[PDB]
Amino acid sequence: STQVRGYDFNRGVNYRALLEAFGTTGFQATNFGRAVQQVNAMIEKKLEPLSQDERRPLTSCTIFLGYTSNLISSGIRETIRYLVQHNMVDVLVTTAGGVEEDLIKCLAPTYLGEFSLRGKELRENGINRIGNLLVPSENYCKFEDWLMPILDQMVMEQNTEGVKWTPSKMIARLGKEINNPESVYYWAQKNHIPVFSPALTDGSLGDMIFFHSYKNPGLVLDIVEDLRLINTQAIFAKCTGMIILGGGVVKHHIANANLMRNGADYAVYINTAQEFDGSDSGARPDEAVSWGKIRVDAQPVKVYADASLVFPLLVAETFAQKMDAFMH
Amino acid sequence: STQVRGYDFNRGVNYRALLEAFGTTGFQATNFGRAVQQVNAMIEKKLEPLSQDEDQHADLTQSRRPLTSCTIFLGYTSNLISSGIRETIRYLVQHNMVDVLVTTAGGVEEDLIKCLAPTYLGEFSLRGKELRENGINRIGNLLVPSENYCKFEDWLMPILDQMVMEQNTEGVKWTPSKMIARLGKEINNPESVYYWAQKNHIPVFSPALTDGSLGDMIFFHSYKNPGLVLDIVEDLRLINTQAIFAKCTGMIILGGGVVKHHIANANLMRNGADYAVYINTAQEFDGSDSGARPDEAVSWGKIRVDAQPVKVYADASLVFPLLVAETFAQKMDAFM
Amino acid sequence: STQVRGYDFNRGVNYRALLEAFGTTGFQATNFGRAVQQVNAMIEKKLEPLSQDERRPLTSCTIFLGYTSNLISSGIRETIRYLVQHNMVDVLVTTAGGVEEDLIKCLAPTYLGEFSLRGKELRENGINRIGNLLVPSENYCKFEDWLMPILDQMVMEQNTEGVKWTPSKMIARLGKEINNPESVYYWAQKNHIPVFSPALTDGSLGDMIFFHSYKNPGLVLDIVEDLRLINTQAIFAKCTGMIILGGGVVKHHIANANLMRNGADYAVYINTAQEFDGSDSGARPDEAVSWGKIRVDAQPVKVYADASLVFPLLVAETFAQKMDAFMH
Amino acid sequence: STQVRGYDFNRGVNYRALLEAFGTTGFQATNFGRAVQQVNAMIEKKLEPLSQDEDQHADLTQSRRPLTSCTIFLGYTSNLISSGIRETIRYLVQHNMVDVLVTTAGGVEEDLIKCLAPTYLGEFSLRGKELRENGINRIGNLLVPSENYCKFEDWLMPILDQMVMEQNTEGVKWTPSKMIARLGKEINNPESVYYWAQKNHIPVFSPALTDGSLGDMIFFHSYKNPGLVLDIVEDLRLINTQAIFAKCTGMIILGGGVVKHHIANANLMRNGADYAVYINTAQEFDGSDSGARPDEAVSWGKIRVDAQPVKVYADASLVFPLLVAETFAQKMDAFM
Ligand SMILES: NC(=O)c1ccc[n+]([C@@H]2O[C@H](COP(=O)([O-])OP(=O)(O)OC[C@H]3O[C@@H](n4cnc5c(N)ncnc54)[C@H](O)[C@@H]3O)[C@@H](O)[C@H]2O)c1
Ligand SMILES: NC(=O)c1ccc[n+]([C@@H]2O[C@H](COP(=O)([O-])OP(=O)(O)OC[C@H]3O[C@@H](n4cnc5c(N)ncnc54)[C@H](O)[C@@H]3O)[C@@H](O)[C@H]2O)c1
Ligand SMILES: NC(=O)c1ccc[n+]([C@@H]2O[C@H](COP(=O)([O-])OP(=O)(O)OC[C@H]3O[C@@H](n4cnc5c(N)ncnc54)[C@H](O)[C@@H]3O)[C@@H](O)[C@H]2O)c1
Ligand SMILES: NC(=O)c1ccc[n+]([C@@H]2O[C@H](COP(=O)([O-])OP(=O)(O)OC[C@H]3O[C@@H](n4cnc5c(N)ncnc54)[C@H](O)[C@@H]3O)[C@@H](O)[C@H]2O)c1
């Protein structure tokens, strides 16, 4: 049985050892160390070779990465981009803001602010607040100018070439169009990583589709085909892992997909929600076990924390140390 | 300036005076009192008489529901339909007290499943392994037997068959709201929220309607009877036009997530809601939309700068029935 | 097994029935109904007559009421006053602010404000913020004028009459001095309900003792005797119940006292804390069971909510309906 | 204006660059970066040379500790001493990097008990009944065998005997801080926070020192050896004078409760702290002092209006070691 003991700074600042010490520090530091172990187990399983019996290359473990939209507003956008760039995860799930703001960041930046800035004076200057971040309205003007010709082409392809659009197919197209290596969705489509977002209309992309539909009516986004697509990613996996940042639709959609295989083998939740309100967001991993979304023999972990603090540290201690195994 | 003073139980127990005293008790009790005031302001504006032409509003919004002097959007996370708040919401919809509903997929399907089989009380700490081994699914401190979903399957599959047939031969272009209206008509049960919503021409928006058991069933059904399409674009047009052609709007939002953003973003299209009450347990510090204060929404234009929005930081299962008791339920004589 | 079902407003607004329906509404409404049941069980046990074998009158169950200081800033001060006035609880525990602000409210009121008011402009006008409440600085001036002559007498009594002051003895004296039926501590001392507050110096009372000690040095407040006094309240009880609003010292001090009898028989927590940070505040009742602070056979309840919303409703459904049993 | 940008792992893993990138990552990562800046400002001011007279400051504050150019108050809730943050705090005290400690009683006693027996890792969900039946006590996801407290009893009772004897025949008037200094000297172990605090003349305030196991032991001891008195009034004088006669003050407060208010209220006596960092998981909505934002303290005069205080909303077991790594631990050459 393992003793509580924190990092001793009389050793100097040995960063790897400082991070390794979270495991024996207690409370959420210990859960962070457990999450490192769960993700490294996902990775080790993924890198094992496939048996006989056992367009994206299939691996020995399929990793679903989910994140709420605000994390793409944050600099965790870079963290996610890196993982997608190097084919370290296999399926992305995010809400609509998490798609559009990645693209918009290729046209204009987001800025630091404070949570307490007052909306009246912000609105008067055309500045929109996302937590302690700030997005000028002009950013969305630029998005409009960029996106509208693409909506024109998608409608034409729908009506003259038989294309049946879904959120994931639109997201791949937008990633191809943005054509920018800073963009998560550019790498996702380049690497054949599907992106699911069933409420893709809930955001600025929706605004633009809405306005567009009055000059160029008839665009259809079907969510049924995308439900088949995400569920089959789980059903035909040798192994699955879930890494879920935040809650809401993203968290349920990944977990429910994995119910179709009688549960994920590995699971890490990082979120700030709590169970007491009965929310899905705040449900503990053990709630998911009752449904079959996480296997009974799994050892899932939740870290109760803002992912903007934890996720880059998690990546540093897991994926980033196995980078070579993921290249060329 | 208003003094802090709690209810004095030397008066005995008058529950109305007790709830009214929330306003001067402080902290979230005070915000509850402010929320009562904001909702009563919405209702008061809604009940003012109107004079507008019936044909152009139906053409612009593509809806059969008459305009009133204030359009009220009610949103709730799915789990509140698992709870007994389902009865609270059903009452409001039954009496045409709100005008637009927004909920995630679970908030649709579990209202229907409750007409087939009940949900039970449990505890948050019940272990998943033993529950799974007995076919019991946990929702917070509630429990749903798996057999409930089997009954749901049997009820729903013939309806999905008809929907595909209507799509392919009668030109129907399904969306979530149109499906939700049809499911409410089929369930044909006065305990159901969506039975009343469709009967009263109250639309229900749920853009991620595949994220739950209804999705499971659509998925399974599609391998027996392929082809169903659910378009979210037309439903975006429908919700936004409800805000655009409103004379006045109020937002009452229980919980966060999709529901909260979808209602607020629709109201951006009219440069902001006139009244807004949030009841949710989220906090701002994580940058989340769920946890964003009303004043964040003001920066975007989702809430008018001149509005007096209120957030109550609390579990809505505690607060929403009390809020309805002090607002809509006092005005039911006007609502008929 | 009990079905989920909310109050049906087609019945009209039947307030008692609306409150009774919280039990079957789920999430924290259900925990509220459970708390009503636990408190009513405390009360029923307290009102049972004492056996042969089995200055405050001893009853069949000793109820400890704890609350954080801010709840006395709130209007829950009236709720607590009522219970103390009618001898419905037996021991009070609160932090220092929870003593002084009760007294100050007899000299000048507290006002409603908002959480977002900015401290600079408040400080410039001599207005102090407590959450969404406001206390003018003048309130504390009035407190100073009222309190200083009492500190003079306590020192004199210490040095010439052998008095050994403790927090609970000072609180009883201050309640006698305030001589005002709106005050919690007036009723507490009148009804021989002891009040424990081991960090009594942490607040305005401390400020005043601090300043006083420079003109009239030597006042001693011993916390050891007060530890014996609260622990013996638990040790020699036939039965104990704990009703704890908020966390911190108050929650631990009551629970630790009841460890000395191998645990409380009944327990209700109402607080907004969560367990994930390892805090005592956020510890669930079942953590206390591991120490022996709550008996293994007890059925404790936590309601996760702001007590300013819940506690008056709890009192309405429990103590207030048994008022007759507590009088004359 | 500063752009949002996360650390780019195409650079490889440079942990310093990774922590520095917190500042531009947003949400609480940004507040962490601001907290690093505030603490480094405190340290920088502390290390400025001073010229003040040694005798009058010792007379006014009744302390042997020399004044520096900034007095840093470090507060932490008890559970952080249960955690491995105990080692973080011990390092700071060992090297005289902070000037005043404030903690609740558990934060005193468990530092001493850890020199006698360890605390172990467990899980939050372990059931109390089975733990109680095996003499294991739960602290969050940590576990303390009851035997740890038996060892504590045996170590402490002879010390309590000496304290009573010194009170009754050598005129000693015990207070919490004076007791804590004596316990640190007796534990005589370089792993102990309070061993280092007393050796370096860093006072420790804990006005409710009876609320925990030390209280249990004082209680039991008093029926064998009556008479110990612990006065909190003189300790109020001692902490307040540390603020009053400071040239500059900074507050670093982990958690809420007594600790947070006691430090901030001491700093009111000088019309406010110059620097302040809160790290805690509390929220404002419940009116709590724990959850009060720094700007509430500004309204009282506890934080100067010209200061730039920062709160990081997070479990300090995650954040405090990183904060120390980026601040105090980089400056240890100056601190010798
Ligand atoms: N919860 C269910 O019963 C259920 C059923 C089937 C599917 N799902 C799916 O789960 C997904 C996520 O659900 P969601 O985003 O709609 O909500 P959620 O349950 O994830 O809640 C989002 C946030 O809303 C707030 N909230 C939740 N419950 C609250 C309460 N009782 N009082 C106040 N505030 C509260 C909280 O801040 C919470 O983090 C949806 O797509 C849904 O279809 C859930
Ligand atoms: N930037 C934005 O936030 C943004 C922009 C456009 C649209 N939207 C829309 O808002 C709607 C709702 O968003 P949602 O459900 O995706 O997420 P959300 O922001 O509401 O968050 C849901 C829950 O996830 C958790 N969470 C959030 N941020 C976290 C963090 N940093 N660390 C840990 N946990 C965290 C919290 O418990 C929160 O209650 C969407 O449909 C989305 O498209 C958001
Ligand atoms: N916790 C223990 O191990 C322990 C041991 C013996 C006695 N006690 C007694 O319990 C009483 C109450 O403890 P308290 O008021 O000092 O603290 P607490 O544990 O009650 O915490 C108070 C608040 O501080 C904040 N906090 C706690 N842990 C945090 C963390 N890890 N990171 C950030 N913020 C955090 C939270 O908002 C919390 O509600 C004290 O009198 C103490 O002596 C506790
Ligand atoms: N008005 C004041 O708050 C005030 C005034 C003077 C002094 N002080 C001092 O502040 C110090 C710390 O206060 P504390 O530990 O007593 O309490 P606190 O206010 O810090 O609260 C401790 C915890 O109790 C819970 N809590 C608080 N308010 C709640 C509510 N309304 N509903 C439910 N739960 C709630 C929260 O989890 C909170 O973290 C004291 O020693 C006190 O004397 C406070």
Numbering used by the authors:
A (entry chain B), C (entry chain B): 28 to 81, 91 to 364
B (entry chain A), D (entry chain A): 28 to 363
Quote the authors verbatim.
Hypusination is a unique post-translational modification of the eukaryotic translation factor 5A (eIF5A) that is essential for overcoming ribosome stalling at polyproline sequence stretches. The initial step of hypusination, the formation of deoxyhypusine, is catalyzed by deoxyhypusine synthase (DHS), however, the molecular details of the DHS-mediated reaction remained elusive. DHS catalyzes the transfer of the 4-aminobutyl moiety from SPD to the modifiable lysine (Lys50) of eIF5A in a NAD-dependent manner. Recently, patient-derived variants of DHS and eIF5A have been linked to rare neurodevelopmental disorders.
We solved a high-resolution structure of DHSN173S in a complex with NAD and SPD. DHSN173S crystallized in the P3221 space group with one tightly associated dimer per asymmetric unit, related to an identical dimer by a twofold axis. The mutated serine residue in DHSN173S maintains the interaction with Asn164, but its side chain, having only one polar hydroxyl group, cannot form hydrogen bonds with the N-terminal part of the proximal protomer. Mapping the N173S mutation onto the structure of the eIF5A-DHS complex suggested that the DHSN173S variant would also disturb the positioning of eIF5A in the DHS active site.
